[PDB]
Amino acid sequence: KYIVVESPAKAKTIKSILGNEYEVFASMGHIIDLPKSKFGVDLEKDFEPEFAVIKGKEKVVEKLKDLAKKGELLIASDMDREGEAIAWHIARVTNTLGRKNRIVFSEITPRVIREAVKNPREIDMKKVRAQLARRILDRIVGYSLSPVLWRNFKSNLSAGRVQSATLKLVCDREREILRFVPKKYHRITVNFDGLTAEIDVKEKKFFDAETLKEIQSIDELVVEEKKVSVKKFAPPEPFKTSTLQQEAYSKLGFSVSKTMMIAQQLYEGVETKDGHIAFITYMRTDSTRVSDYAKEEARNLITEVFGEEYVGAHEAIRPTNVFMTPEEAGKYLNSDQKKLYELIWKRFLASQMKPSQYEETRFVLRTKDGKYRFKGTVLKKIFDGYEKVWKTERNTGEFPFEEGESVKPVVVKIEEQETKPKPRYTEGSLVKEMERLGIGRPSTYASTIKLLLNRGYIKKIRGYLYPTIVGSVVMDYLEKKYSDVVSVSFTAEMEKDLDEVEQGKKTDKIVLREFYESFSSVFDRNDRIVVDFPTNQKCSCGKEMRLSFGKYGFYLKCECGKTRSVKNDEIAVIDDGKIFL
Numbered sequence: 379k380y381i382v383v384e385s386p387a388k389a390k391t392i393k394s395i396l397g398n399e400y401e402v403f404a405s406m407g408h409i410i411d412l413p414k415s416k417f418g419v420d421l422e423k424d425f426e427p428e429f430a431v432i433k434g435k436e437k438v439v440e441k442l443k444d445l446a447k448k449g450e451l452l453i454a455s456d457m458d459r460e461g462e463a464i465a466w467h468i469a470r471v472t473n474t475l476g477r478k479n480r481i482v483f484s485e486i487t488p489r490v491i492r493e494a495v496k497n498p499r500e501i502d503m504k505k506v507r508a509q510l511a512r513r514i515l516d517r518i519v520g521y522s523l524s525p526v527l528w529r530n531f532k533s534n535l536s537a538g539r540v541q542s543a544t545l546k547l548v549c550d551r552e553r554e555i556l557r558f559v560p561k562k563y564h565r566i567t568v569n570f571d572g573l574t575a576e577i578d579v580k581e582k583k584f585f586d587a588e589t590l591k592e593i594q595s596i597d598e599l600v601v602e603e604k605k606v607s608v609k610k611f612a613p614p615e616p617f618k619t620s621t622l623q624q625e626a627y628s629k630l631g632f633s634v635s636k637t638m639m640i641a642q643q644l645y646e647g648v649e650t651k652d653g654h655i656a657f658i659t660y661m662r663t664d665s666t667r668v669s670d671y672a673k674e675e676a677r678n679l680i681t682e683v684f685g686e687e688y689v690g691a692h693e694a695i696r697p698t699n700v701f702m703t704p705e706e707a708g709k710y711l712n713s714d715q716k717k718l719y720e721l722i723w724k725r726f727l728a729s730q731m732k733p734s735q736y737e738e739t740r741f742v743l744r745t746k747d748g749k750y751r752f753k754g755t756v757l758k759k760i761f762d763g764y765e766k767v768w769k770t771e772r773n774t775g776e777f778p779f780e781e782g783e784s785v786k787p788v789v790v791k792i793e794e795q796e797t798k799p800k801p802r803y804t805e806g807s808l809v810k811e812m813e814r815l816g817i818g819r820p821s822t823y824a825s826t827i828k829l830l831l832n833r834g835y836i837k838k839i840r841g842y843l844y845p846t847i848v849g850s851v852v853m854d855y856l857e858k859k860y861s862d863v864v865s866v867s868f869t870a871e872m873e874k875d876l877d878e879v880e881q882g883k884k885t886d887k888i889v890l891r892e893f894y895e896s897f898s899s900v901f902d903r904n905d906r907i908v909v910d911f912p913t914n915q916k917c918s919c920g921k922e923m924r925l926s927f928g929k930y931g932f933y934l935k936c937e938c939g940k941t942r943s944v945k946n947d948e949i950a951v952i953d954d955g956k957i958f959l
Contacts, residue, residue, distance in 0.1 A: 533848060564793065604741045851952070
């Protein structure tokens, strides 16, 4: 009996579980792939893919074949569509496709793996076709456009439409910021007994000087309205991929790629010397679902540690063993691993606890002349519930006053302010937006972001993401020549379609034929352009500068001064055909 995995870390963990019952073999990654050099898809035979053994993996292939002749060869790749395709490759080279030989699991624990190896299944060809269709789409786009982008801008669109749609989100945000016109207004607050209230106005306003003098003179208010109601706050959901990446960015400072690397370590298992042990469930998931087993262990822990009054195919990202507390975990985990584990643990435990309960007092105060009103709220905690674990500070206090009572002293604070544009994306907030719009999936949020940064299409400055000269220019070309095909809308629609292919609810060939019609109608292989944009930069002679591109890359020029060179990753946005540096 042989078990095949992709990584040496997974092999160790599974071997720790099963011992001598099974022989465990690691492929050291992929064995078979589309031709590295050639296009590798036959457009004349309904998008038929061409596969070749990866150079350097031939010995691996031969060993797989040998093992499959010696006993049953179970395949324990990860459960996503990429893993399913790895499993399909192994089955095909070994001539075992159709046998119940594929093992399915969300965690690498004694309990789950021991059961999983006794219940193998047939490879899921729906999942395989979804994956192969993604590979084919990216290959059609990549091999068509990357030469055209090399010819014109010395660049390329490898990670296909998902990369281009995410780049577009960043450029779209940058234009929103560029076009924003701030408005001056006053923030007016009244303060009394640890409470605050804001002036009640229909919209933000810059008040005239005499009005400000009048308002600043207020030293007494009357309670006009007080409404008290019970407010419950729901606990957070257990993590999925997108939410882990967001929160680990905002709470720990981890780039999304670092979060996925640490999370892989904790899912695959780490070497301790109580053997090789796993800490979390699989890290590529769109689900916040929790197993009955996990729910019950969490109830038991909560009941015991906090009290029973605190008790509230893909799975959430959660600890495998809730009794492996963060404190316990530090004997085994490095500092970064322990931070992520702790985050995951608290999120999951909190998700299983009661909503918190507060009394909210909503109040209105007025001047005695009836000219001005101020509104505020205050909360009083009744029950902390999940907040004992998912630490939360709210605006708490006391409102002892009743309707009609005068309040004195009151202190007024008037502050000149200016409206602000939407913030730029951070890695975490870009992932939020990709999920919101159906762009990218658990396997591709982090690698898409990493790729955009690595190619210089976007640049990070103090955690914020900016489009660049080459990012802006490439995006503009794609929009001009491939409008519909590279839209956020068409990219999200394709992702939905691949998910239906996965579920057996649409056909891969229909999806591909339909895409290829759309693409091939607009695709122009010989397109030769001259980069030439007006800009927001001026020469000292007075003339405006224009952006050009030559053998030494991008430069600025005018019809009287000297030419300034510009780097590919200088920050830039194109709006209405003009490049803003």
